[PDB]
Amino acid sequence: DPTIIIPKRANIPTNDLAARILRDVKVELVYNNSLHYVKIRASVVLDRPSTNAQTP
Amino acid sequence: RFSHWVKFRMEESVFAYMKRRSDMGLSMKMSDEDLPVLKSVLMNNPINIGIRNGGILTGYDTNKVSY
């Protein structure tokens, strides 16, 4: 989830107060890229061939 | 001959179910919730073929008791 973090007045340096400037506002995200390539492992057979049946 | 056939096929039918049920794990267990299935196991292989072929008798008598 994207997150936004903002400082408090106690953490702002006095020089920044004098200059009337706000610093260190931070944001974070994640990009959701797309697909480009696909590969397959097809197989052709003339027929088909352990029975554990126990929940892993 | 009938008695021998019934004996052999009952042993065969019980063993085959038990082994197949023990080969997947989940082996049979001695509990009231698992034992009744032997009713179906036995009723299936020998008895339901004997009735169809006519060797085993069925119906009601008069002795006043079912066959």
Side-chain angles (χ1 to χ4, degrees), chain A, chain B residues 1-32 34-67:
Chain A
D1 43 49
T3 301
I4 302 185
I5 288 156
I6 295 168
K8 318 191 140 72
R9 182 178 163 87
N11 303 354
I12 294 172
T14 56
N15 310 103
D16 288 333
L17 288 178
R20 299 183 171 161
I21 186 169
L22 180 76
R23 296 183 204 279
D24 314 63
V25 181
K26 299 165 192 172
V27 176
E28 301 166 32
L29 311 93
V30 174
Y31 182 81
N32 190 23
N33 55 22
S34 302
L35 178 75
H36 284 164
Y37 292 107
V38 164
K39 281 193 155 67
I40 308 173
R41 304 294 320 269
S43 66
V44 170
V45 294
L46 265 289
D47 62 357
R48 300 205 196 197
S50 184
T51 45
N52 188 249
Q54 190 173 114
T55 278
Chain B
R1 281 194 77 217
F2 184 79
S3 79
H4 281 181
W5 173 88
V6 170
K7 188 260 179 191
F8 295 147
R9 304 274 270 210
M10 264 162 174
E11 182 180 359
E12 175 28 88
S13 198
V14 172
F15 168 84
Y17 165 77
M18 192 166 327
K19 161 161 168 45
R20 174 191 91 121
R21 171 63 189 292
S22 184
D23 248 7
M24 332 176 288
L26 304 173
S27 76
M28 280 200 81
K29 301 197 183 194
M30 302 173 304
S31 72
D32 287 7
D34 212 301
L35 292 170
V37 73
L38 293 182
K39 294 184 77 88
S40 307
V41 175
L42 300 168
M43 201 75 227
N44 170 249
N45 183 334
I47 309 294
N48 263 251
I49 280 85
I51 283 167
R52 184 176 65 195
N53 288 34
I56 297 169
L57 189 57
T58 49
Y60 190 86
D61 193 330
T62 309
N63 293 295
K64 293 135 289 305
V65 287
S66 55
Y67 287 146

